[PDB]
Amino acid sequence: VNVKGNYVQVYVMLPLDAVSVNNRFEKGDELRAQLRKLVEAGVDGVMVDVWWGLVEGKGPKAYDWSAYKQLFELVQKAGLKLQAIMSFHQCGGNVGDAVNIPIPQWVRDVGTRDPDIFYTDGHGTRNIEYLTLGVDNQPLFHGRSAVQMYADYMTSFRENMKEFLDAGVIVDIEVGLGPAGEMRYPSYPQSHGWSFPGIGEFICYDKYLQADFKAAAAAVGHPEWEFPNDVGQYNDTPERTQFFRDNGTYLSEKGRFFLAWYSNNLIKHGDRILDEANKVFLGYKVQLAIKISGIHWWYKVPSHAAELTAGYYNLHDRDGYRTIARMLKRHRASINFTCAEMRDSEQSSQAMSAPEELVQQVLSAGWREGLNVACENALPRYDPTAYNTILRNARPHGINQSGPPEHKLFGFTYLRLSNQLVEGQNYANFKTFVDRMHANLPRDPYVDPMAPLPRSGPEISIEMILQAAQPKLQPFPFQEHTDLPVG
Numbered sequence: 001v002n003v004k005g006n007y008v009q010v011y012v013m014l015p016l017d018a019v020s021v022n023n024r025f026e027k028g029d030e031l032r033a034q035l036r037k038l039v040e041a042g043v044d045g046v047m048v049d050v051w052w053g054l055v056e057g058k059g060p061k062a063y064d065w066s067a068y069k070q071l072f073e074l075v076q077k078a079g080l081k082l083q084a085i086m087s088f089h090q091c092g093g094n095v096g097d098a099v100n101i102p103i104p105q106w107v108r109d110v111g112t113r114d115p116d117i118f119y120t121d122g123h124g125t126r127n128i129e130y131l132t133l134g135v136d137n138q139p140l141f142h143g144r145s146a147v148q149m150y151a152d153y154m155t156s157f158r159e160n161m162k163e164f165l166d167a168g169v170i171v172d173i174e175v176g177l178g179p180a181g182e183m184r185y186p187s188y189p190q191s192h193g194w195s196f197p198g199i200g201e202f203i204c205y206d207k208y209l210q211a212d213f214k215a216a217a218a219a220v221g222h223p224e225w226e227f228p229n230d231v232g233q234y235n236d237t238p239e240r241t242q243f244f245r246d247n248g249t250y251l252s253e254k255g256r257f258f259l260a261w262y263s264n265n266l267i268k269h270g271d272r273i274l275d276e277a278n279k280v281f282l283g284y285k286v287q288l289a290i291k292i293s294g295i296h297w298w299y300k301v302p303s304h305a306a307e308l309t310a311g312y313y314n315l316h317d318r319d320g321y322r323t324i325a326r327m328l329k330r331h332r333a334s335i336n337f338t339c340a341e342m343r344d345s346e347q348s349s350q351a352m353s354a355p356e357e358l359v360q361q362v363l364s365a366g367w368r369e370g371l372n373v374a375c376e377n378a379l380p381r382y383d384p385t386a387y388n389t390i391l392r393n394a395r396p397h398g399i400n401q402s403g404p405p406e407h408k409l410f411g412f413t414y415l416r417l418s419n420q421l422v423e424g425q426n427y428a429n430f431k432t433f434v435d436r437m438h439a440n441l442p443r444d445p446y447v448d449p450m451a452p453l454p455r456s457g458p459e460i461s462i463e464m465i466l467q468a469a470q471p472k473l474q475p476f477p478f479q480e481h482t483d484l485p486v487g
């Protein structure tokens with residue numbers, strides 16, 4: 001009997017403005033006090049947004065790392081590990097978001113003469129939270145492309161934070177690839193005309209993506225093809241549209257081409273930025289991760305409409321997450337997925353929502369491609385049931401008494417630290433959750449050591465990535481309930 005191989009690391013997300021909207025570290029005493037409560041609970045580490053808009057706010061290459069170094073020093077002195085998100089996106093900007101941190105003003109200024117640097121919907125609405133993947137390789141930003149700006153930021157981060165890396169404080173680099181840091185399109189703009197559980201919209205109308213589609217359509221002998229026009233609008237349901245309805249045009253040749261194109265572009269966006277990240281962090285003992293958004297609504301209907309509009313080309317017979325996983329493989333990148341706290345019975349009937357099955361599909365895809373998989377909770381939860389659902393997903397086959405289980409999450413990150421979390425009943429529930437994730441063992445500061453990051457393997461074509469889509473395989477079997485609940 002040795003249950004050590006069952007331990008799952010638990011990280012906690014810091015507050016969104018751990019660093020102030022003015023790029024100052026102003027909450028040091030309050031955070032130290034909260035971190036003491038996390039250390040008392042046995043937490044392995046914390047996660048924090050490293051906001052592009054704060055650090056490179058002045059101008060190109062004018063990186064101001066002062067506040068972040070203060071924060072990282074505080075985390076180190078607390079004996080906690082650190083997952084750093086390269087947050088190339090806007091924080092907040094919805095009603096009524098308390099914390100609002102845009103991308104750098106000088107980047108946005110380029111959009112005054114070139115508004116097509118932003119993902120754009122079919123109404124022409126520009127989303128200012130992130131730069132279109134369409135401009136990844138366009139030298140529009142005082143001579144740099146978007147990918148070059150991302151690479152340069154990560155390089156400056158590595159150089160400035162080298163002591164924290166070498167000391168084993170920073171153990172994970174999560175590469176932001178879209179809105180909210182997630183590798184997706186902004187298909188569900190909650191403050192600009194989407195409400196849950198709308199199907200969302202395709203956000204591929206920027207002129208760069210239009211030109212790319214035109215070139216792609218021409219290469220297969222269909223210069224006449226255009227984006228689907230029978231797709232309805234953000235707050236529709238699938239049967240409101242000819243495209244997404246059961247037996248709809250999403251199944252057609254044109255529909256398939258478009259959906260492959262839209263989803264492949266996200267895959268290529270991830271691959272090219274991860275290649276850069278891998279070069280930056282080469283030889284450091286860190287995990288590189290991407291975040292996949294949890295689009296659980298409409299998972300139960302044939303079109304998987306909300307997944308499709310977010311950029312996940314996922315159907316009953318097409319595994320739209322295992323393609324992503326296959327692209328990650330060469331980089332030795334991990335999947336960070338959400339919804340690990342949700343039960344299907346917690347969702348409204350009308351949303352046709354299947355978070356449990358979606359989690360199961362994404363985890364199984366990752367594991368079949370040999371990846372490390374970690375999770376977050378999607379929504380704030382403080383109750384034993386939410387923790388017991390996380391536990392189930394953390395060890396789907398339960399505990400192995402003599403050695404490592406067959407499948408397990410590499411890590412779990414809790415959203416998010418606040419004063420509410422670390423007091424009263426919420427805290428008692430959380431501490432017990434951490435014990436159970438650790439298989440009732442104490443915190444192991446040596447757990448899950450990372451080898452020096454090797455260089456990405458050979459680039460593989462999109463055709464090679466897409467061999468992972470079919471045949472769609474059944475997920476690995478998950479226990480209905482955890483064998484090590486909180487109580």
Ligand SMILES: OC[C@H]1NC[C@H](O)[C@@H](O)[C@@H]1O[C@H]1O[C@H](CO)[C@@H](O)[C@H](O)[C@H]1O
Pocket residue numbers: 013016048049085087090091092180181182291338376377378379
């Ligand atoms: O962690 C990414 C996102 N996961 C799904 C949740 O429902 C989102 O709230 C979450 O995004 C939020 O937190 C991250 C991490 O701090 C931040 O980068 C996003 O901007 C924020 O919206």
